[PDB]
Amino acid sequence: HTTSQKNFYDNLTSTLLRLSTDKIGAIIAIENQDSLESYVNIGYRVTSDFSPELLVTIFYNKQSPLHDGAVIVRDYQIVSVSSYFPMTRQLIDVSYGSRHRSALGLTEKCDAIVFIVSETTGKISVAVRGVIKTLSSNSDRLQDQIIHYLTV
């Protein structure tokens, strides 16, 4: 109930905070009502609990292709890595990179919530319904922000 949900919020926060401080680029897409099955089939099917330990294994190896593309999460479980999304059609600030545009592109087509970490700055963003917003790197505020965007 609340225990699986709250562990996911704690583990997603911790993971995003880690990738941020280490400036490791990352996309983590969270399925809602719209099926991302097509995009799962584009990447590599891996099923597991959303564990910081597994996401560290993946992302802290720049040689591995698993560190590339997006992680897709369904029902608090990882279902794929290395998934690619369509680019946004919007005119967006130049500061936003490839990952940001793929994330926006996905959310323009369906109800997925996508989090992005910037490899350049370390900043954490969320894309929801064709809108992208920057989240704080402060640990306390970030968790509340993450919960808001996943419960809205």
Please work out, in degrees rounded to the nearest 5, the angle formed at the alpha carbon of residue 87 by the alpha carbons of 47 and 70.
Answer: 20
Among 4, 5, 61, 139, binds a second copy (CB under 8 A): 61
Going edge to edge, which strands form the sheet with 70-74? Answer: 77-83, 70-74, 26-30, 113-117, 124-128, 131-135
Least distance from C-beta 92 to a second copy, angstroms?
A: 31
- The site that binds a second copy (CB under 8 A) totals a number of residues, namely 18
Is residue 4 near a second copy by the rule CB under 8 A? Answer: no
The sign of the dihedral angle between the CA atoms of 88, 74, 37, 31 is negative
Is residue 66 near a second copy by the rule CB under 8 A? Answer: yes
Is residue 64 near a second copy by the rule CB under 8 A? Answer: yes
Is residue 14 near a second copy by the rule CB under 8 A? Answer: no
Give phi and psi for 94, each to the nearest 5.
-65, -25
Segment 21-50, which members bind a second copy (CB under 8 A)?
Answer: 44-49
List interacting residues with a second copy (CB under 8 A): 44-49, 51, 53-54, 56-58, 60-61, 63-66
